[PDB]
Amino acid sequence: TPTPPQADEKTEDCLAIINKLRSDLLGTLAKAEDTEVTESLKAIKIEEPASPTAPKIAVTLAGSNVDTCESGEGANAKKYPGLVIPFPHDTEFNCNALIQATYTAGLDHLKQSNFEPSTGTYDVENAPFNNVNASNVAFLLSEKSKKVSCAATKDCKAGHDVLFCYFIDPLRKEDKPFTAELYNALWGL
């Protein structure tokens, strides 16, 4: 019977880079506590793993065997809405580097997309938000985001560890992730 990977809370390691990227069109985010994440998930009918939190979801996404973490590389937000970044088991965790890289790649993917802010909705199964980086940028830059809880698996012996950040309130299918004003400002940068 396999031993699962373990996850550490990473909110304090990640909140500086998240709030740097959001910054007067977006509010800063505060830390979400576990209770808040569990209740936010319960409101969108997500109750497994029991009393779900960012650490428990990072583990769920990486896999149930620390010897393989065989699902980490393919992890995404198709079920658990939030930022998802797999990283190799043999690398040092750097939240600044990981989130900056998803931001640059995801904003490039959106710019390359026929996505328009007036018509474009969030759908993790269709372009452009079926790209995990583009999905990650939608959560990072969401006007619905007020709080965040981040966690990462720390001890995968193979495969990819996973960073997961849960935003309250989550983007959901058919939300318009950006106003025209914010989307125009992202081109300005």
Numbering used by the authors: 54 to 76, 81 to 246
Task: Quote the authors verbatim.
Eimeria tenella causes caecal coccidiosis in chickens and has a SAG family with over 80 members making up 1% of the proteome. In addition, a further 20 regions of the E. tenella genome were identified as encoding sag pseudogenes. While it has been established that SAGs are expressed on the surface of Eimeria parasites, it is currently unknown whether these proteins are involved in aspects of cell adhesion, invasion or in some other process.
The structure of E. tenella SAG19 was solved by sulphur-SAD to 1.32 Å to reveal that the protein adopts an αβα sandwich fold, and providing an experimental three-dimensional model for the protein. EtSAG19 comprises a four-stranded, anti-parallel, β-sheet surrounded by six α-helices with an additional 310 helix and 12 loops, 10 of which connect regions of regular secondary structure together with two additional loops to the N- and C-terminus. As predicted, given its cysteine content, EtSAG19 contains three disulphide bonds, SS1 (connecting C67 and C152), SS2 (connecting C126 and C213) and SS3 (connecting C207 and C222). The structure also contains three cis peptides, two of which involve proline (E105-P106 in loop L4 that links helix II to helix III and, A184-P185 in loop L7 leading to the 310 helix, helix V’). The third cis peptide is more unusual in that it is a rare non-proline cis peptide between I225 and D226 in loop L11 linking strand D to helix VI, forming a tight turn in the structure. Analysis of the structure shows that these sidechains participate in an intricate network of hydrogen bonds that help to pin the extended loop L3 found between αI and αII to αI and the C-terminus of αV. Therefore, the conservation of N72 and the buried arginine, R75, are particularly important in preserving the overall 3D structure of the protein, and, in our view, act as a fingerprint for the fold.
